[PDB]
Symmetry: C2
Subunit: 418 residues, 2 copies
């Protein structure tokens, strides 16, 4: 039999879904509609997937969808539909945010655009509004180009809601030495003639010939609300372990979807590509008739500013307390190598533990050589490891790799004894 499967996405989740259902059902007609020029060369045609780029979906209803591609407007039939249209920038409500000066760090075109622009009309000073992940990277990006950079965050510190203050402090310390960090400020508007000229906030004004808004992202749910799909308390599309929505045969994965936290169990929205990919993977499995449950996410994340790396996995102390846990914590400094081997950098680990179960609730790591600590910790968290379980986990050691007591085991010892 045939079965028409239609995917409104094209990004990480859309294509993972597409590929899984195609490989499981070669005889089925799987299509992907990307409202854009990007994916992940349409090699996919050979893969057996009918990709349509710059094909925008403008109406959807049960069994069908209407897309406008190449001026034309055609409508397609579907048995199984998958919402995989990710998230989009959320523009702030400040005066004039559309002048030739402003740019948002999103789709690769902007990367071509924004960059090209600068590498044209000479741009010296550049201001970034946002103390989030995106903000920080763009900051690093520009400083590296020698351009003077200035960050504006309304909160008391950057990454204000993603990490606790003790991890952030190490980052801010380094950050302040390459970018002009302006906290507690609220932008109030941004004047100029044909191009952005100056940015003004309730504390001062700043020279600016390029501006980046890293003020936020929102799930692209409009098309789904049209199908009457239930959207979660988080603002993203409600979903179950199979990536199923409240409407029959309608799945949703990636940045549009709201998933569940593996630790707290409540619903969350963690728009990160690794999970998105798997979300699309199980959506496609279930569509093709093979049961597969997605456990949920840990909220794992990582980024960096120049050489100081920062990462988390699991609950933060803010989150853990917010959730009503009785927690004990620990914050330790350690080294990336034995204190003799050359190249040993510094590494800081924050640990949050459930005092009642001695269960590790979350770990935050900043400094150097973070990836090993957070990935191991994520596995531990995924398994419900206690402070004791982590201490006795047989991790690797060699002078060029790490110290006899891995920074993760140290934190564990310190939590256990507390």
């Amino acid at each position: 039999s045939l079965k028409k499967v239609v995917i409104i996405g094209g990004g990480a989740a859309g294509m993972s879904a597409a590929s899984r259902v195609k490989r499981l059902k070669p005889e089925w007609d799987v299509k992907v509609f990307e409202a854009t020029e990007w994916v992940s060369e349409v090699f996919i045609k050979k893969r057996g997937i009918d990709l349509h780029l710059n094909a925008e979906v403008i109406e959807v209803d049960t069994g069908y969808v209407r897309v406008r591609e190449n001026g034309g407007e055609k409508s397609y039939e579907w048995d199984y539909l998958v919402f995989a249209n990710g998230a989009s920038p959320q523009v702030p409500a400040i005066e004039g945010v559309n002048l030739k000066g402003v740019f948002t760090a999103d789709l690769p075109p902007d990367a071509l655009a924004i960059r090209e622009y600068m590498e044209k009309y000479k741009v010296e000073n550049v201001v970034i509004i946002g103390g989030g992940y995106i903000g920080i990277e763009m900051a690093e990006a520009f400083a590296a180009q020698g351009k003077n950079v200035t960050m504006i965050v309304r909160g008391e510190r950057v990454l204000r809601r993603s990490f606790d203050k003790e991890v952030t402090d190490i980052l801010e310390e380094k950050l302040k030495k390459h970018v002009n960090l302006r906290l507690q400020e609220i932008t109030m508007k941004i004047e100029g003639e044909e191009r952005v000229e100056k940015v003004v906030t309730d504390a001062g004004e700043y020279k600016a010939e390029l501006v980046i808004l890293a003020t936020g992202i929102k799930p692209n749910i409009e098309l789904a609300k049209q199908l009457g799909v239930r959207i979660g308390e988080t603002g993203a599309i409600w979903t179950n372990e199979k990536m199923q929505t409240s409407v029959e045969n309608v799945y949703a994965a990636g940045d549009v979807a709201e998933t569940r936290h593996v630790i707290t169990g409540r619903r969350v929205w963690v728009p990160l590509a690794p999970a998105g990919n798997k979300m699309g993977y199980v959506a496609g499995s279930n569509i093709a008739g093979k049961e597969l449950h997605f456990p949920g996410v840990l909220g794992t994340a990582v980024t960096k500013f120049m050489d100081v790396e920062i990462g988390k996995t699991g609950l933060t102390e803010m989150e853990a307390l917010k959730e009503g846990y009785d927690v004990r914590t620990a914050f330790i400094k350690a080294s990336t190598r034995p204190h003799y081997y050359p190249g040993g950098r510094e590494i800081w680990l924050k640990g949050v533990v459930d005092n009642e179960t001695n269960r590790l609730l979350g770990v935050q790591v900043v400094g150097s050589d973070i990836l090993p600590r957070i990935d191991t910790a994520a596995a531990m968290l995924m398994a419900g490891f206690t402070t004791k379980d982590a201490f006795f986990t047989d991790l690797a050691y060699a002078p060029p790799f790490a110290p006899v007591w891995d920074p993760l085991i140290v934190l564990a010892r310190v939590l256990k004894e507390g």
Copy 2:
């Protein structure tokens, strides 16, 4: 009450034990007896531990120990004993093992000594005997010295018993380009006038000013055998979860102690530093009246030759088949970064799986940026994760740290669909 703890060791396992019994029971008399001049700097004297360097133990019995220190003998009483006397190099029974230019990489003076003989007597050609970790790490050394190196291994390939062939081949590939690798050759003679001149093997002869005997390590169970302590089927001291031996109130930890494999349950001998420190830690805790259990080890190992790192955790395909397991494996190649991002190096992963439980039995990794994978896999293995559990672990992602699908998740995926 007064309890007299005596530790025959001084090494990692030894000090952990002392440091633990001492913290938990400040009032007890804890004495460590090192035959040598090194440990882990009597800051340990302030911790309350009565450390005795150059205090070689020569006899032991139910009530006392007879150590030979400072010309004369002395006997100390003990209510609790701990064998933490580690392991010694095992020399081949061949001609002139003691020519002035021959060494074994063990006790700290060896480093100073070897580097002295090399940094004094002009040394050009250095010969290494054995294809172990010690052999390979030593090659990387003299090779980086500009010195010419020739390695002799009697087996068909290096790390013949520790890693599967497809993993070691990558290593040998880099190895054959900086060292003269001589496989399947049994060393027979090492000759020279007063100092080593050459080495002769059943396949030829090589010239050497300095030779490294990295052919094996062996548990120092002699003083324990004297006390009737049951020694394991592996050759090292038998032990239980609390690091107790067959003799009452006698514990053992470190390279002398035989532990158990977490995945297999069989008794194994895995002389590594992290495990040792923990064995010693639980030995103490238990002597002090605090029940603690060491779960055993995974066999986690890591090492590297120049820029090609090689590691593992859990069973090897050889071991798995050896244990009667129904296995399916997978070997994949991947990038350490997104394949667009600059800096991406190659990384290889071999995974073993129980075809009946779908539980991961082991992971061997080779190439670049190894640590994050084998450490994460260690935790997964430590928890009894299936191919599917591993697939869904929330690992971190950002272009500077890793690709969207971590190579560990890629392996899981390939194993799962396997």
